[PDB]
Homo-oligomer: 186 residues x 2
């Protein structure tokens, strides 16, 4: 269990960074993958190749905590990234590329080290806690569903500028990944 | 099957290939790399998926070729219109100019809209692809299972030249690094 709760922040999704196929709720607290290219203007901030979107918030100092609902989802990537991350084309999620993430992919939980580190989770999470300590260079992930158990911590992170909450809802080739990512209500 | 007498020698068209694809010197094998492969962007190149086309173009006749899929966790294979879109996101369907089958997360499917599940008993290691342009037919055969029929698209509206089509798939799991190979004649 942890004591990051007193550092919780209210995250909203940045529509200008969202892949053109994403459908984001009115309050910008939920996101799902849609079935068509969804009428949005071209900009350099927008992720082009993956169902990714950033939180609107920028962090250059302090301790921040937020929670993400992943109930019923078969794939997702979650964490935090540099504002400077590549938006266009193909790229790997790694600290070198400015991403500190974990994911669910094909029934396996992984930390986004390079190469990936498989995580042994006894209770599949329905909700994920994400903690960032900017000055310390720490990004931690917690299994809210299972006693706030620790999933993984990145340490000695090179943030090298502002950080952004990071989300990938994932594609849905099997039909089993339609569920949204939701930011849990504080 | 009885399509062996229509076999053609297929080679891969480098200019069409996703930029992370590693294509052998003989242009008969392809696998997913972990970085860009120092190729320049062009209008032909698939941008969003690890796809590549055969260099050959067909507007008539009967053609057959074979692809090795040994070990691979995921792939898409078949034939497509030369006019298919190369950029952005799209589904593989006849409406979009693709006649394909795939292996995705332990299920074999045909690329209809919506997808049609296949009835494969023996997991293939090699797939034979037959196209009869005039007949409007694309058929898939399980070479591993004595050439048994997998799937036939008929009443195909080819609507112009066709290209062999390949997708090696991404390798997020670490378990899909295997190449696609064009089997020797």
């Amino acid at each position: 269990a942890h004591h990051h709760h007193h550092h919780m922040v209210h995250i909203t999704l940045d529509r200008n960074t969202a892949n053109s196929w994403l459908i984001i709720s009115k309050d910008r607290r939920q996101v799902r993958m849609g079935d068509t290219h969804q009428n949005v203007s071209d900009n350099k901030e927008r992720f082009s190749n993956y169902p990714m979107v950033l939180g609107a918030q920028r962090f250059s100092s302090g301790k921040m905590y937020w929670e993400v609902d992943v109930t019923q989802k078969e794939a997702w990537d979650l964490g935090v990234c540099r504002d400077s991350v590549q938006r266009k084309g193909q790229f790997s999620l790694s600290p070198e590329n400015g991403f500190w993430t974990i994911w669910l992919w094909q029934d396996s939980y992984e930390a986004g080290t390079s190469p990936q580190t498989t995580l042994h989770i006894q209770v599949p999470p329905c909700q994920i806690g994400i903690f960032v300590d900017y000055e310390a260079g720490v990004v931690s992930f917690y299994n809210i569903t299972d006693h706030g158990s620790l999933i993984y911590t990145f340490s000695e992170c090179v943030f090298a500028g502002p950080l952004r909450p990071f989300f990938n809802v994932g594609f849905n080739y099997s039909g089993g990944n339609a569920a949204p990512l939701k930011l849990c209500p504080l």
